[PDB]
Amino acid sequence: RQVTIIGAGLAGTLVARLLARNGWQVNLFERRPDPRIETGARGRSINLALAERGAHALRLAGLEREVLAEAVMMRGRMVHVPGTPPNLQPYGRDDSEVIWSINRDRLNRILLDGAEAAGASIHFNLGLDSVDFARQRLTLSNVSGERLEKRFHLLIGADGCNSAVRQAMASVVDLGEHLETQPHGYKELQITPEASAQFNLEPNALHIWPHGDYMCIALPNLDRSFTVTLFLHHQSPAAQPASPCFAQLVDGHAARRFFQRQFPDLSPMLDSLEQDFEHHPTGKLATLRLTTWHVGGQAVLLGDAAHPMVPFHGQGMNCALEDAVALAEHLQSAADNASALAAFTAQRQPDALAIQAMALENYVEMSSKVASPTYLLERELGQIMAQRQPTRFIPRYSMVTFSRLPYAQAMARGQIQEQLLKFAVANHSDLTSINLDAVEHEVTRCLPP
Ligand SMILES: Cc1cc2nc3c(=O)[nH]c(=O)nc-3n(C[C@H](O)[C@H](O)[C@H](O)COP(=O)(O)OP(=O)(O)OC[C@H]3O[C@@H](n4cnc5c(N)ncnc54)[C@H](O)[C@@H]3O)c2cc1C
Numbered sequence: 444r445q446v447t448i449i450g451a452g453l454a455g456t457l458v459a460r461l462l463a464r465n466g467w468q469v470n471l472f473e474r475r476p477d478p479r480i481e482t483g484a485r486g487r488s489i490n491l492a493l494a495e496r497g498a499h500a501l502r503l504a505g506l507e508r509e510v511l512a513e514a515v516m517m518r519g520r521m522v523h524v525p526g527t528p529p530n531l532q533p534y535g536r537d538d539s540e541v542i543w544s545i546n547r548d549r550l551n552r553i554l555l556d557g558a559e560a561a562g563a564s565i566h567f568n569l570g571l572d573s574v575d576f577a578r579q580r581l582t583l584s585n586v587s588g589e590r591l592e593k594r595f596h597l598l599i600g601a602d603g604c605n606s607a608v609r610q611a612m613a614s615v616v617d618l619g620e621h622l623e624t625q626p627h628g629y630k631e632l633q634i635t636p637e638a639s640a641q642f643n644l645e646p647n648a649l650h651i652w653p654h655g656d657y658m659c660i661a662l663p664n665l666d667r668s669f670t671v672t673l674f675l676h677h678q679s680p681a682a683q684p685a686s687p688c689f690a691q692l693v694d695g696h697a698a699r700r701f702f703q704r705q706f707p708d709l710s711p712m713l714d715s716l717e718q719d720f721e722h723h724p725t726g727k728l729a730t731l732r733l734t735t736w737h738v739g740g741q742a743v744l745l746g747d748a749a750h751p752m753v754p755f756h757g758q759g760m761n762c763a764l765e766d767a768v769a770l771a772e773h774l775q776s777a778a779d780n781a782s783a784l785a786a787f788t789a790q791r792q793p794d795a796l797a798i799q800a801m802a803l804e805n806y807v808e809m810s811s812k813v814a815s816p817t818y819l820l821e822r823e824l825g826q827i828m829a830q831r832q833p834t835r836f837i838p839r840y841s842m843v844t845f846s847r848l849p850y851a852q853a854m855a856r857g858q859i860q861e862q863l864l865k866f867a868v869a870n871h872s873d874l875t876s877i878n879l880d881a882v883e884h885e886v887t888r889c890l891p892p
């Protein structure tokens with residue numbers, strides 16, 4: 444039937460295309476101006492990691508080829524630690540599995556074009572303000588001030604981590620929200636193609652410079668430049684009041700000092716550091732959990748609107764595209780919007796909750812320069828079991844990243860798997876001491892195919 448979608452980011456535009464193909468009258472409203480008009484700007488140039496999960500959703504929409512055409516392939520993770528040979532941990536035990544680096548703005552344009560080619564009407568320069576649920580009315584506003592009321596039948600809030608739809612819903616039901624804040628902010632920097640080729644930075648990998656309480660990440664672009672993200676506390680905790688934070692970094696020069704002392708091997712590749720640091724705003728992170736994502740058959744949330752998460756597993760978009768697929772499936776196969784929205788929430792909620800936890804946990808893996816003898820021993824054993832039983836023992840990263848297993852099933856399995864490894868490894872100094880066959884027997888006993 445009819446649907447009104449608020450937000451033409453990743454979730455909203457994908458879901459609009461799918462509803463529009465399956466014969467829905469679709470209207471998508473977007474606060475921002477159409478980004479497809481050509482200008483003299485270079486842009487923000489944000490990079491996102493697209494995994495098998497998200498790529499699959501795009502495959503379902505018939506958009507995979509177009510998106511992949513502009514993606515840079517990442518074959519492994521490259522971990523840079525000073526006084527160390529930058530070691531490339533490939534993705535898998537083979538190299539069929541990959542992660543793609545796609546420019547966020549390219550992706551969005553592909554998506555918009557795909558939304559319209561399916562029949563969706565997109566309306567830019569219009570932000571949701573309010574929602575009258577009793578009288579089924581929407582109020583939008585344009586920056587020039589004016590207001591515009593539209594009726595609606597189904598409302599889809601795909602309007603991002605500060606969703607106004609979610610906010611409107613909260614006015615009329617209790618969403619049981621729990622906000623968990625992240626002490627890290629982030630800041631976007633760049634490594635130019637000039638700098639990139641000079642340092643022989645491998646373009647075809649994900650780069651990370653771990654630093655404990657803070658770290659940098661780098662995904663590459665078609666032009667061989669890299670987009671770089673610094674995760675750092677906003678403020679130093681009470682305990683260690685001298686530790687690095689954004690507060691102490693009060694201009695490019697303090698920032699350059701910070702980088703030259705703490706990231707000596709990364710700093711010389713960051714030519715425009717001072718500029719980037721003063722102009723680009725410091726971003727905030729948070730995990731937000733809701734018990735309910737819908738109001739009867741009137742309104743549902745998906746993507747970041749429904750479940751903001753920390754970026755540490757690189758799965759936010761991947762999850763959002765997955766949500767879009769699931770929502771359209773439900774809306775299509777259900778007796779009514781009510782059944783469809785409930786059914787959607789019941790399916791996707793557990794998965795949102797699972798990746799939200801896994802992303803929070805992923806921080807410390809990425810962040811520690813030297814892993815502990817325990818984690819390293821477990822990881823060694825886990826690879827060995829992964830070779831011997833690829834139907835049963837699949838490392839959690841791979842379940843999440845390189846597979847389509849529901850996020851919750853990944854979590855549940857990684858729970859059993861890690862338990863297995865922990866007990867196998869305790870009171871052992873290294874693999875010498877561990878009988879592999881006994882461990883394989885336990886893997887087989889404990890983990891269903
Ligand atoms: C630093 C950082 C790094 C990340 N890296 C990755 C990664 O590597 N891989 C990955 O999969 N995910 C990553 N993510 C997360 C990912 O970007 C998000 O989960 C994804 O963008 C969510 O998509 P969405 O459609 O639900 O929300 P959005 O993409 O934010 O889209 C909502 C759309 O909302 C429109 N909008 C907002 N408010 C209104 C309004 N009031 N009225 C009308 N329209 C509105 C927005 O302007 C936009 O058009 C990262 C996030 C951050 C912060």
Ligand SMILES: COc1ccc(S(=O)(=O)Nc2nc(-c3cccc([N+](=O)[O-])c3)cs2)cc1OC
Pocket residue numbers: 532804808818821822823824825826837838839840856857858859860861
């Ligand atoms: C909470 O912690 C864990 C949670 C889950 C697992 S697991 O069950 O999924 N098993 C395993 N994953 C790997 C693995 C292998 C190769 C590279 C990577 N990698 O992310 O770079 C991981 C090795 S063992 C292990 C854990 O270890 C502490």
Ligand SMILES: Nc1ccccc1C(=O)C[C@H](N)C(=O)O
Pocket residue numbers: 491492649660672754755756757758805809840844
């Ligand atoms: N894009 C990101 C942004 C911030 C933090 C991590 C990422 C990742 O790429 C996740 C990757 N799969 C990882 O295991 O570290």
